[PDB]
Amino acid sequence: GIVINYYTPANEEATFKAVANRCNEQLGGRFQIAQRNLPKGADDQRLQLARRLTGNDKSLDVMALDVVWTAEFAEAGWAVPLSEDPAGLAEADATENTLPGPLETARWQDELYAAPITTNTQLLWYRADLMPAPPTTWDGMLDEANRLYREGGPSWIAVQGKQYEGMVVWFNTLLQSAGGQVLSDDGQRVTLTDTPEHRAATVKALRIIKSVATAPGADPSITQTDENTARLALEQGKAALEVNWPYVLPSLLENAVKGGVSFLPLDGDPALQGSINDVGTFSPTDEQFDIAFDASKKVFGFAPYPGVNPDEPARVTLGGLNLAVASTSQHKAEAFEAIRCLRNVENQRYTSIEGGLPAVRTSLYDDPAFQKKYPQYEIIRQQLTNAAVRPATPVYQAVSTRMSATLAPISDIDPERTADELTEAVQKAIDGKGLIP
Amino acid sequence: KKSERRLAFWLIAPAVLLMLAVTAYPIGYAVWLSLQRYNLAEPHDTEFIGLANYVTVLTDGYWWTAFAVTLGITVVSVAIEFALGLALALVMHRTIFGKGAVRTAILIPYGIVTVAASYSWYYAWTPGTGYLANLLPEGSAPLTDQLPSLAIVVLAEVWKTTPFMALLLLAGLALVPQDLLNAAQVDGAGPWKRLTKVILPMIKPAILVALLFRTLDAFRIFDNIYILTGGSNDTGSVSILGYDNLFKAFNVGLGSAISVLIFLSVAIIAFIYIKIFGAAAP
Amino acid sequence: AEIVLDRVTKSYPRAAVKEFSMTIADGEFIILVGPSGCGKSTTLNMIAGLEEITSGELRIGGERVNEKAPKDRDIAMVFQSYALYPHMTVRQNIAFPLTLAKVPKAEIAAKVEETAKILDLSELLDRKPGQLSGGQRQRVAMGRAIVRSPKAFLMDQPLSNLDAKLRVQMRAEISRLQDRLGTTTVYVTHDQTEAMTLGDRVVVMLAGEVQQIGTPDELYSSPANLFVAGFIGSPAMNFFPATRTDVGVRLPFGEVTLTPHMLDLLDKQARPENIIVGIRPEHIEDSALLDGYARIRALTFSVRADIVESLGADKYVHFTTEGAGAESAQLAELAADSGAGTNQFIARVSADSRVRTGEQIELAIDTTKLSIFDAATGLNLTRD
Amino acid sequence: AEIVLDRVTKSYPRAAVKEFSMTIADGEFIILVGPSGCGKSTTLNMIAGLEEITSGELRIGGERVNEKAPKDRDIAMVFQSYALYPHMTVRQNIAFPLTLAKVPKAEIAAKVEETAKILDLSELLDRKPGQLSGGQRQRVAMGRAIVRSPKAFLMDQPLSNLDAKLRVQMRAEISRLQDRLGTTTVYVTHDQTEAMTLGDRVVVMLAGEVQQIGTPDELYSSPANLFVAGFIGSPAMNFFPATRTDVGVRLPFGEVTLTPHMLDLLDKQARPENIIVGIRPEHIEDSALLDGYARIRALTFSVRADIVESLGADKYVHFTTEGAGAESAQLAELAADSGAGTNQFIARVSADSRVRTGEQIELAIDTTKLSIFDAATGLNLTRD
Amino acid sequence: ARRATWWSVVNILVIVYALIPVLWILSLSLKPTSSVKDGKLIPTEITFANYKAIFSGDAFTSALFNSIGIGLITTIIAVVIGGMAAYAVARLQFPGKQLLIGVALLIAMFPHISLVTPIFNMWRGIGLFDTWPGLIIPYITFALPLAIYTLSAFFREIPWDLEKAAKMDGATPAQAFRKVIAPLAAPGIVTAAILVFIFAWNDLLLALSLTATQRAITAPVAIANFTGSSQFEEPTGSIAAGAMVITIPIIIFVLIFQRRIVAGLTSGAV
Ligand SMILES: Nc1ncnc2c1ncn2[C@@H]1O[C@H](COP(=O)(O)OP(=O)(O)OP(=O)(O)O)[C@@H](O)[C@H]1O
Ligand SMILES: Nc1ncnc2c1ncn2[C@@H]1O[C@H](COP(=O)(O)OP(=O)(O)OP(=O)(O)O)[C@@H](O)[C@H]1O
Ligand SMILES: OC[C@H]1O[C@H](O[C@H]2O[C@H](CO)[C@@H](O)[C@H](O)[C@H]2O)[C@H](O)[C@@H](O)[C@@H]1O
């Protein structure tokens, strides 16, 4: 049949396979969604496509991409905006009921080069196994680590500590809850020190960064940290809190029903046994869900992220995935229709439910089964409305590596120096200059 | 004469054309690409002329340091490699019993897919898991922290190349007459002094070409770094720097220029071994 | 100095020397001989110390010399290959032994000039071994030994890979050099003619052990065994099948009543019966101008010419003997060198013999210099 | 049939064969002689039909040899390298000609068994070349010629890599089996002794020119020129330096008048005063039993034997004899064959002679049987 | 006596120096998810599941196939062009092949990545973006010298005087050729074909850039990317099993070819 390859990160492939099958049934055999399964690695996945694009691989069809590099891919013409889809519908479809921030984020020079499909932000994901309430301030997070470490308790708190985009994103969130930003809203000028107050916020964040680099009873091995290990620290009870994406909830509920969550051994429960199906995947009745959900509420609470100042709501950095038809695509109009069907409300339902992660249709906020499927959705909605966002910038990829390079030297974190150093680096990045480290 | 001469030209022509075509156009297209300053992300944005484009790279401390670490890696590797290479070739030659099975033992690690060995050397040095790593104290993890990992790079890779050096060096021990060694050992030189004074000059040409190959093949290395670190700990070699341009920068001008500078950099050391030391093929 | 050894064995998976004991005086030009594989080149290895000791002890003057002092044994030896180091000029190669002996450089230079004037070599001191004639290279190998002026010089087949003319000419050089030196000198060979060229004493051996040792004329005239009797000379004695009568010997034709003293010497032992006659081919002639006392005892019989050639002073005529009775372990292992058949023989008759091939001709024997051997023990009854 | 050639010339970039003309009668075992690098292998290559021809139109008896396919010549040959087939057994190697000729298997099997039993090699026909001696390999190459029953045979020095003891057996084998074959058969060699040992007639060449053809005793007694006289007999006839008196020599050594008939034969064209004679060392004796007719022309005179050696029934003695007359191009290129000085000679004297090294002693000579040669003309004045 | 046992000890140390790390790889492929250096000697449970886990990876099975096929075609092409240019060592023209064939060995040493860039640029222009010839042509270029060189080593032995023996014998030139020349040469060819196959198949620097499609990915690069579609970041005993199945081919080659292949590499020291 007429295959459409859904090129995506491999991490959720089972969801994509089952929904693609449901879509292939719905397509009446006209054309077939097929999973092309990118590296777990972000960058790798993102840059492996650049190879296949540059060669114009004729098998390249529908590409998932992270919101950030879209400006570059649009400028290079690697995908076509939703106005150009010969089905005509695609622009209106991406306009219809899509939440505002993601829709704006796809609008490169106001043109939607691609359609939003999923989104994420990091929670103040707090275990109630020890702490009475989450610290709503990042200094409060140092205080709870200190207290728990003085108690000899579950003192760690889990964060994206390794040298890849996760550290940069965390920094961007810290910076913008401190009101700071990396470049102007046009991208036309560095803004980390374009006010001395931006400089102050930058070195204030640098002081925060150096302090969390050494906080009492933190994760002793945070140097290379990622969500895999970060969840592992909380669910083992080594940490009491996780700074992590909404995937923390379903993956924790699965592991509780594996019995691995130290304070939540839901593997003991005959309704939750077998809810982990033949492929080990939690698949509950309304009863099995409510049982596990109530038992989780008894020992955990999601919350908005710790503010950069006392009682300041954190402008958490927004994230998400957009789908785009690559300009290689032979079946380009059919691919536009396939994009439309993955945008359909039952797909949005399935991806929020079986897929466990935030869909982008606003109308699902009004669904009790979505409110059940994502109890945090309203915190998500508020934090999304409050969110920081990375600057729409074709050079973003390179800029972010240039920023990352400065962070690398963890041992010496001279706020005043490193802020000027990275300022030079991002100037050189905007200049496009030099053989890249 | 002319009958055979024209025949030989026609006989050699296919390979000569093949090797020419698969080299000349590539080097040409590279040189054309350098100063034709351009990016795959900027598909119509070609500079029609880019003077001193290569001088940007030549001026970059990040290039110059990347250049330097490649040499530091190679020459150390080559040195210990040579010392082991002759030690192996000597044993492999002078065996009391097992020369066949030892030949098998020599070839197996040479014949390996190089990525497999690279992964072997990558795990043995991961903390907790590594059968070598666990013998260190805590906080070590020698894959990390730049310079300690380069020791593992050298170790890993010379273990991979050494039998090939031994094979090539055995050509010296093979040509030398055993009675010439008996005549020498039937004189006034203690065994080490006798063996060195007699064998070394006979070993000279094989030694020269072994160093010539081992130098270049180490210099144009990639696998045993990339398949053991991302170049991330400033472990980036010349080669990984070369690759990252086509991997991420997409400035074909830069990628060319480093490729060209790499070609000059081998061209000089080849010219030294060839002309200054007098090396030539069998 | 003088050369001596006692109880010498070396053993390999067996005994390449059978506890050998012997000596040669100082200033001599001795020669050693045997078939390939007899241990001969081995004995040189043992003398070099490059062969170890199972049993026995040695000296070159002094005492008890070990195998861990080859350079301290004051010896030198050009190898059977004539091999020499191409990593040098001839001058550097000839200097190599002396400079390795820590000789001061001007003495080293004078010493190589001395040697290079002694030999055919000063003209090519600047050439490397890669650009020498086989003869000049062989000469250079001699140089590489004699530069040491050793307490013994040990020629291990240094003149065998040349052509015949080069070999005999080199023998005259070797003579005049050993004469010029007056030093103790040894040579070793897979053939008798090398020692027939010169040997101030001559030794012959088999299977790791000496079979005769002494002056070359006694060696030539009175062989101690069938082995040594076959090894000496190119026309070996036609060891004809015979039996012992109480008056002499029954040969296949021209059989004899033996001269009374030689007969009563034969009668001095009771056991011998199986015996063979030493028909040394040069002791045989035509009667056609034999006008002298030999006609008392011509003992002639008619023999068939398988081939004859007037190859020099002699018509060498091939024939074959009658009957049987010349089969033994010594005869068989001596016959390992060439296709000796079962009775195939030659006479070295003078070439003025008026004779042709295929015919049967009366052949006269100098029985005044005939001889006899005991066939089972494999040694001469006639002489020792 | 016979085999023949005329005007035969071959010319490299320089004239390794030149105008040559000959025929060999059938069953002749002709021996071919010259220095190494005479036209030997080239003429062999020309006879094989592989070599190009500058001039001539030879006949392999019944066909124009310069004018026909090489395999179609129906000959056989053996190379001095022993060209052999390591991917075969000896049996498969013996079958190589038969299988080349598409011979049926049962006939081929009988043929290899026959030639393997003409050899001794039937003991190991299952072996490959990896497990043969060089002699066994050589014989096998001989068998690779023999089994095909060709019109003719060629031998490019097959004996060469055997030792002397092997080589004499080979000379006899070659002789007997060439006799058993009755074919036109050719052998080429560098040494004179093998050509003395075998071959009905002999032919000798230099620089692509055929110098003489004849029976080997005519070559032994009337060689046409000094170089072709010197190339035969290893104790070569001593060219004692001489000048003419019209009665004999103005003797530097001896005192010799020339016998009157030999003198008046010389006088017919006695243009050179500078001359030499072939003093065959076998002429030269100690006068030990010289009474009667041998007294009349003994001409005995002294030299001091530098060295003497008891080789056999002759104890050869070296001596020196000063004089003028032994200078020529023929003698110079004879010395390029091998150098020995200018006055240095040997006597093949009887081993019972009283001579001991280091004495002046009077040597007798049978002077009535000396040759005479033009030192200026380079040619034998006595005979050709 | 004792010197031989001493030598044998030196020999055992060499065999250990070879066998150890690949044994660490093969044994590590069988771990029961231990991840803790416990399987130092005789692993607790020999966990067969890695074998079926890698065999279920049809991306890998295609990458294996692609690598084998591109190996076979390149050895064939490289041998047939290389041999008939290692020939013309019987020929020796006025110009001087030997003096100029220096380049062949020099380009064997060449830094692949220096031409990888302009090669990829050309393949970005042409239709051959990452189809099989996009490997086969570049691979042939680095196969070529060692093929020429090793066939030239056998042809320095090839005793052309056997043609004189053949011409002197009754067989026609073709009849003799097809029953001596090929019989002599064949071990030299097949060992060179195995050798250039091994030297080709170990390559990665080009393949890990000038390719991305499932149609042209090869076993080395596939094994290097086995970090993707692993269950839970377990490219561990799985990637080790991948290495094992890549390397068994090498072992079963070299354990047969040992005596011959060293003669090829040494050019005569069999
Ligand atoms: N190291 C050894 N180990 C075992 N056997 C040996 C050794 N050296 C010599 N032999 C024996 O000696 C024989 C070789 O002959 P030899 O050692 O006398 O050297 P050669 O060169 O043959 O002597 P020559 O040239 O004087 O005949 C072989 O058959 C072998 O069995
Ligand atoms: N192809 C050639 N080009 C130039 N000169 C040659 C060639 N072949 C032979 N010659 C010269 O011609 C001479 C005749 O050589 P030929 O092959 O007849 O005998 P040979 O093999 O040199 O010596 P012999 O035959 O006595 O062993 C040689 O001395 C050689 O130098
Ligand atoms: O939520 C799962 C996704 O995690 C990664 O992407 C997130 O983390 C990146 C930083 O490392 C952010 O840039 C990105 O916005 C986040 O979505 C991973 O790269 C994705 O493949 C996962 O889908």
Short mmCIF file of N, CA and C in Angstrom, two decimals, chain B residues 4 8-9 11 14-15 18-19 22 26 29-30 88 91 95-97 100 102-105 107 109 111-114 116 119 121 123 128-129 131 134 159 164 167 170 174 216 220 239 243 259 262-263 266, chain E residues 4 7 10-11 14-15 17-18 21 35-37 39-40 81 84-85 91-93 95 108-114 118 141 144 202 209 220 224 235-236 243 246-247 250 254 258-259 261-262 265-266 269:
data_model
loop_
_atom_site.label_atom_id
_atom_site.label_comp_id
_atom_site.label_asym_id
_atom_site.label_seq_id
_atom_site.Cartn_x
_atom_site.Cartn_y
_atom_site.Cartn_z
N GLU B 4 54.78 -4.94 -25.88
CA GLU B 4 54.58 -5.16 -24.46
C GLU B 4 54.29 -3.86 -23.72
N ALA B 8 51.00 -3.42 -21.56
CA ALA B 8 51.06 -3.11 -20.14
C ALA B 8 50.25 -1.85 -19.81
N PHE B 9 50.35 -0.81 -20.63
CA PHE B 9 49.53 0.39 -20.46
C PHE B 9 48.05 0.02 -20.50
N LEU B 11 46.66 -2.88 -19.93
CA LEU B 11 46.39 -3.75 -18.78
C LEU B 11 46.27 -2.97 -17.46
N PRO B 14 42.73 0.31 -16.31
CA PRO B 14 41.46 0.31 -15.58
C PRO B 14 41.63 0.70 -14.11
N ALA B 15 42.61 0.09 -13.43
CA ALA B 15 42.92 0.41 -12.04
C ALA B 15 43.43 1.85 -11.91
N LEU B 18 40.44 4.08 -12.27
CA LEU B 18 39.63 3.93 -11.07
C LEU B 18 40.19 4.71 -9.87
N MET B 19 41.45 4.49 -9.52
CA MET B 19 42.10 5.18 -8.41
C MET B 19 42.21 6.68 -8.64
N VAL B 22 38.36 8.18 -8.39
CA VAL B 22 37.94 8.14 -7.00
C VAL B 22 38.82 8.97 -6.04
N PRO B 26 37.32 14.21 -6.07
CA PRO B 26 37.16 14.50 -4.65
C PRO B 26 38.07 15.60 -4.13
N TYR B 29 36.97 18.94 -5.86
CA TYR B 29 35.71 19.40 -5.31
C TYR B 29 35.89 19.93 -3.89
N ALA B 30 36.78 19.34 -3.08
CA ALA B 30 37.11 19.90 -1.79
C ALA B 30 37.74 21.28 -1.95
N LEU B 88 56.47 -9.00 20.01
CA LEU B 88 55.62 -10.03 19.44
C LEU B 88 56.28 -10.70 18.25
N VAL B 91 59.00 -13.11 19.36
CA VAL B 91 58.47 -14.34 19.95
C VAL B 91 57.85 -15.22 18.88
N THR B 95 59.72 -19.10 18.35
CA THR B 95 58.92 -19.99 19.21
C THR B 95 59.55 -21.36 19.47
N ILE B 96 59.47 -21.83 20.71
CA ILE B 96 59.87 -23.19 21.06
C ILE B 96 58.94 -24.28 20.50
N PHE B 97 57.63 -24.00 20.36
CA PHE B 97 56.63 -25.00 19.97
C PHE B 97 55.48 -24.46 19.10
N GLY B 100 52.18 -22.01 14.92
CA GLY B 100 50.87 -21.99 14.25
C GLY B 100 49.77 -21.40 15.12
N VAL B 102 50.04 -19.69 17.83
CA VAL B 102 50.41 -18.31 18.11
C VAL B 102 50.09 -17.41 16.92
N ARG B 103 50.32 -17.84 15.68
CA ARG B 103 49.85 -17.12 14.51
C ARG B 103 48.35 -16.89 14.60
N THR B 104 47.57 -17.92 14.93
CA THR B 104 46.14 -17.76 15.16
C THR B 104 45.85 -16.71 16.23
N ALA B 105 46.56 -16.79 17.35
CA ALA B 105 46.41 -15.87 18.46
C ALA B 105 46.74 -14.43 18.07
N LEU B 107 46.57 -13.18 14.87
CA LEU B 107 45.68 -12.66 13.85
C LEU B 107 44.31 -12.32 14.40
N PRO B 109 42.93 -10.87 17.17
CA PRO B 109 42.71 -9.51 17.61
C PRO B 109 42.97 -8.49 16.50
N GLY B 111 42.24 -9.09 13.28
CA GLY B 111 41.16 -9.30 12.33
C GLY B 111 39.81 -8.77 12.80
N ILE B 112 39.72 -8.35 14.06
CA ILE B 112 38.48 -7.93 14.70
C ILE B 112 37.81 -6.77 13.96
N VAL B 113 36.48 -6.69 14.01
CA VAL B 113 35.80 -5.44 13.68
C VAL B 113 36.17 -4.42 14.74
N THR B 114 36.73 -3.29 14.35
CA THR B 114 37.33 -2.37 15.32
C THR B 114 36.32 -1.81 16.33
N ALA B 116 33.96 -3.48 17.79
CA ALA B 116 33.76 -4.47 18.84
C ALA B 116 34.79 -4.28 19.95
N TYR B 119 34.06 -1.16 22.00
CA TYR B 119 33.06 -1.39 23.02
C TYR B 119 33.60 -2.21 24.16
N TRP B 121 36.70 -2.14 25.25
CA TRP B 121 37.48 -1.18 26.02
C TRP B 121 36.62 -0.09 26.65
N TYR B 123 33.52 -0.80 28.05
CA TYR B 123 32.80 -1.39 29.21
C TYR B 123 33.80 -1.72 30.32
N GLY B 128 31.82 0.11 38.30
CA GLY B 128 30.98 -0.99 38.81
C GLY B 128 30.97 -2.19 37.87
N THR B 129 30.59 -1.98 36.62
CA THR B 129 30.48 -3.02 35.61
C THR B 129 31.84 -3.53 35.15
N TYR B 131 35.36 -5.02 34.58
CA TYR B 131 36.26 -6.01 35.18
C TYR B 131 37.65 -5.45 35.53
N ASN B 134 36.62 -1.75 38.46
CA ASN B 134 36.37 -2.01 39.88
C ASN B 134 37.65 -2.07 40.74
N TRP B 159 46.29 -2.07 21.38
CA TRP B 159 45.96 -3.48 21.46
C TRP B 159 45.31 -3.96 20.17
N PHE B 164 49.33 -6.36 13.52
CA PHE B 164 49.66 -5.95 12.17
C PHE B 164 51.09 -5.43 12.08
N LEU B 167 53.36 -8.57 12.30
CA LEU B 167 53.39 -9.24 11.00
C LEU B 167 54.33 -8.52 10.04
N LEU B 170 57.96 -8.91 11.16
CA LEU B 170 58.49 -10.26 11.00
C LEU B 170 59.22 -10.44 9.66
N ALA B 174 62.55 -12.67 9.20
CA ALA B 174 62.49 -13.67 8.15
C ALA B 174 63.65 -13.58 7.15
N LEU B 216 50.52 7.07 9.80
CA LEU B 216 49.38 7.60 9.07
C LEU B 216 48.08 6.97 9.54
N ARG B 220 44.86 9.22 10.99
CA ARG B 220 43.52 9.33 10.41
C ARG B 220 42.55 8.43 11.17
N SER B 239 40.01 14.05 13.58
CA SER B 239 39.00 13.35 12.81
C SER B 239 37.59 13.69 13.25
N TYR B 243 34.59 15.32 11.23
CA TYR B 243 33.26 14.76 11.09
C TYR B 243 32.17 15.72 11.56
N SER B 259 39.47 19.10 5.86
CA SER B 259 39.87 17.96 5.05
C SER B 259 41.16 18.21 4.28
N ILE B 262 44.07 18.47 6.67
CA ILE B 262 44.38 17.09 7.00
C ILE B 262 45.23 16.48 5.90
N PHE B 263 44.88 16.65 4.64
CA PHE B 263 45.70 16.14 3.56
C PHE B 263 47.12 16.72 3.58
N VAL B 266 49.17 15.02 6.51
CA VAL B 266 49.79 13.74 6.16
C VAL B 266 50.87 13.93 5.13
N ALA E 4 62.63 -24.59 27.59
CA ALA E 4 61.45 -24.87 26.78
C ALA E 4 60.15 -24.59 27.54
N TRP E 7 59.84 -20.88 27.74
CA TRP E 7 59.29 -20.36 26.46
C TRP E 7 57.78 -20.59 26.43
N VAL E 10 55.96 -18.02 28.14
CA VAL E 10 55.91 -16.79 27.33
C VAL E 10 54.82 -16.88 26.26
N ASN E 11 54.74 -18.01 25.57
CA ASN E 11 53.70 -18.29 24.58
C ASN E 11 52.28 -18.20 25.19
N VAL E 14 51.19 -14.65 25.68
CA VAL E 14 50.76 -14.05 24.41
C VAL E 14 49.33 -14.48 24.07
N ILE E 15 49.01 -15.76 24.18
CA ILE E 15 47.67 -16.26 23.88
C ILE E 15 46.63 -15.62 24.81
N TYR E 17 47.03 -12.58 26.20
CA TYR E 17 47.03 -11.19 25.73
C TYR E 17 46.11 -10.98 24.54
N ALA E 18 45.99 -11.98 23.67
CA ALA E 18 45.01 -11.99 22.60
C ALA E 18 43.60 -12.32 23.11
N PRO E 21 40.11 -9.97 26.10
CA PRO E 21 39.05 -8.97 26.02
C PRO E 21 37.88 -9.44 25.17
N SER E 35 25.14 -6.65 35.29
CA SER E 35 25.77 -5.32 35.13
C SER E 35 26.85 -4.95 36.17
N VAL E 36 27.48 -5.93 36.82
CA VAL E 36 28.26 -5.70 38.06
C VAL E 36 29.60 -6.46 38.11
N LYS E 37 30.14 -6.87 36.96
CA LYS E 37 31.41 -7.59 36.87
C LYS E 37 31.46 -8.93 37.64
N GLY E 39 30.29 -11.93 36.41
CA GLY E 39 30.63 -12.97 35.46
C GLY E 39 32.10 -12.99 35.08
N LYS E 40 32.97 -12.71 36.05
CA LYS E 40 34.40 -12.72 35.81
C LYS E 40 34.80 -14.09 35.27
N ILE E 81 40.07 -6.41 -10.90
CA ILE E 81 40.82 -5.26 -11.39
C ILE E 81 42.23 -5.23 -10.80
N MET E 84 44.79 -8.29 -12.40
CA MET E 84 45.23 -7.89 -13.73
C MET E 84 45.91 -6.51 -13.78
N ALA E 85 46.26 -5.95 -12.62
CA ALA E 85 47.17 -4.82 -12.49
C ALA E 85 48.33 -5.11 -11.52
N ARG E 91 55.29 -8.13 -17.09
CA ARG E 91 55.64 -6.89 -17.79
C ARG E 91 56.40 -5.93 -16.88
N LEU E 92 57.18 -5.05 -17.50
CA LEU E 92 57.98 -4.04 -16.82
C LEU E 92 58.34 -2.99 -17.86
N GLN E 93 57.34 -2.19 -18.23
CA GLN E 93 57.49 -1.13 -19.24
C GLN E 93 58.56 -0.07 -18.97
N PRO E 95 58.50 3.24 -18.87
CA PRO E 95 58.06 4.24 -17.89
C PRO E 95 58.50 3.92 -16.47
N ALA E 108 46.68 3.83 0.29
CA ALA E 108 46.21 2.90 1.32
C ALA E 108 46.22 3.54 2.72
N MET E 109 47.19 4.42 2.96
CA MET E 109 47.36 5.15 4.21
C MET E 109 46.48 6.41 4.33
N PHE E 110 45.77 6.81 3.27
CA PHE E 110 45.11 8.11 3.20
C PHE E 110 44.03 8.31 4.28
N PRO E 111 43.88 9.51 4.87
CA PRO E 111 42.82 9.79 5.84
C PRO E 111 41.42 9.87 5.21
N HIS E 112 40.62 8.83 5.39
CA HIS E 112 39.30 8.65 4.75
C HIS E 112 38.43 9.90 4.80
N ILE E 113 38.32 10.50 5.97
CA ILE E 113 37.46 11.65 6.23
C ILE E 113 37.80 12.87 5.39
N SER E 114 39.06 13.03 4.97
CA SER E 114 39.48 14.16 4.15
C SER E 114 38.74 14.17 2.82
N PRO E 118 33.91 15.84 0.39
CA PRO E 118 33.62 16.07 -1.02
C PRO E 118 32.93 14.87 -1.66
N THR E 141 38.19 1.74 -3.65
CA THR E 141 39.34 2.64 -3.71
C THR E 141 40.33 2.38 -2.58
N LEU E 144 41.90 -1.35 -3.08
CA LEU E 144 42.74 -1.51 -4.27
C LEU E 144 44.22 -1.76 -3.97
N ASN E 202 35.73 -4.44 8.07
CA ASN E 202 36.06 -3.69 9.27
C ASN E 202 35.88 -2.17 9.15
N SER E 209 28.84 7.89 7.95
CA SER E 209 28.42 9.22 7.48
C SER E 209 27.73 9.17 6.13
N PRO E 220 28.57 -2.94 11.28
CA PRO E 220 29.29 -2.15 12.26
C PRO E 220 28.45 -0.96 12.71
N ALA E 224 26.74 -0.11 16.36
CA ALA E 224 27.01 1.15 17.04
C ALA E 224 25.74 1.93 17.39
N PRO E 235 21.86 -1.77 25.54
CA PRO E 235 22.71 -2.19 24.43
C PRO E 235 23.91 -3.01 24.96
N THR E 236 23.68 -3.80 25.98
CA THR E 236 24.69 -4.33 26.87
C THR E 236 25.05 -5.73 26.40
N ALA E 243 28.41 -8.17 18.51
CA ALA E 243 29.84 -8.33 18.26
C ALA E 243 30.22 -9.80 18.08
N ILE E 246 29.20 -10.99 14.66
CA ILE E 246 30.06 -10.39 13.64
C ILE E 246 31.42 -11.10 13.59
N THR E 247 31.94 -11.53 14.73
CA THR E 247 33.35 -11.94 14.82
C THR E 247 33.57 -13.43 14.66
N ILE E 250 35.08 -14.04 11.33
CA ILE E 250 36.52 -13.80 11.31
C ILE E 250 37.27 -15.01 11.84
N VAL E 254 39.95 -17.27 9.84
CA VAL E 254 41.38 -17.23 10.11
C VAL E 254 41.90 -18.56 10.62
N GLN E 258 45.08 -19.29 8.34
CA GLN E 258 46.28 -18.91 9.09
C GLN E 258 47.59 -19.10 8.31
N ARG E 259 47.96 -20.35 8.03
CA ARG E 259 49.27 -20.60 7.35
C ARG E 259 49.36 -19.79 6.06
N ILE E 261 47.49 -17.08 4.97
CA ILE E 261 47.30 -15.63 5.06
C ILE E 261 48.56 -14.92 5.55
N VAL E 262 49.31 -15.52 6.48
CA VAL E 262 50.58 -14.92 6.88
C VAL E 262 51.57 -14.86 5.72
N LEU E 265 50.53 -11.72 3.80
CA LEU E 265 50.88 -10.49 4.51
C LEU E 265 52.39 -10.25 4.52
N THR E 266 53.18 -11.28 4.81
CA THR E 266 54.64 -11.19 4.83
C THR E 266 55.24 -11.08 3.43
N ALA E 269 57.41 -14.85 3.73
CA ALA E 269 57.84 -15.52 4.95
C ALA E 269 56.77 -16.48 5.51
#
